[PDB]
């Protein structure tokens, strides 16, 4: 009967520790970069490349005309 | 008292089940995280953009002065 | 006693396996990019997007004026 009580006690402690380890693991995971975030960043750079290209072309035409 | 212990194991049964589900959820989240990589390619593109934007700023300042 | 002891042993096996899974996930997590290490790239891109927005507006204004 002390045999069972001690097994249940081992289970209690190990469950409690696992709960804390999982809580820490989710905090760590939350601080990692999402694939979606990287994709957003790449698409913003693509947007910037395109806008800068158009601006260059626009500025070149303005420059000629102002002359 | 055996009932008290049964209730305790019932609690732990549920907690172990929840923990199994939390671990599977965390696996899925990890799969959607970006692997460490060399940032050279993205950084080089941003460096090109900052140079082009700097040069554009200078050009647009000149025109703004002339037109005004 | 026996039936409850067996249930407890079953749960100890599951907890044991879970501890190993968690150790393993910690290792996977180490191969992932830290969000904080992307902060500089992200901010630079946000700066550039604003600068390009303002440059576009100024160019369109000048163009209209000259045209």
Author numbering:
A (entry chain E), C (entry chain F): 1 to 67
B (entry chain D): 0 to 67
Mind quoting what the paper says about this structure?
The observation that the T9 construct could accommodate the MATKDDIAN insert in two ways, forming the β-layer either at MAT or at KDD, led us to wonder whether the same could happen with the A9 insert, IENKADKAD, if the glutamate was interchanged with the central alanine to mirror the first six residues of the T9 insert (A9b, IANKEDKAD). We reasoned that the larger glutamate residue at the center of A9b might even be sufficiently unfavorable to move this construct quantitatively to the alternative structure, with the β-layer formed over the first three residues (IAN). A9b in fact crystallized in two alternative structures, but in both the β-layer formed over the central glutamate. Since this residue was indeed too large and polar to be accommodated without distortion, the first turns of the downstream helices are perturbed to different extents in both instances, leading to a pronounced kink in one of the structures (highlighted in pink in Figure 3A). We were surprised to see that the penalty introduced by the central glutamate was not sufficient to produce the alternative structure; the reasons for this are unclear to us at present. The Ramachandran plot in panel B includes all structures except the kinked grey A9b structure; all residues of the β-layers are shown as red dots and all other residues as black dots.
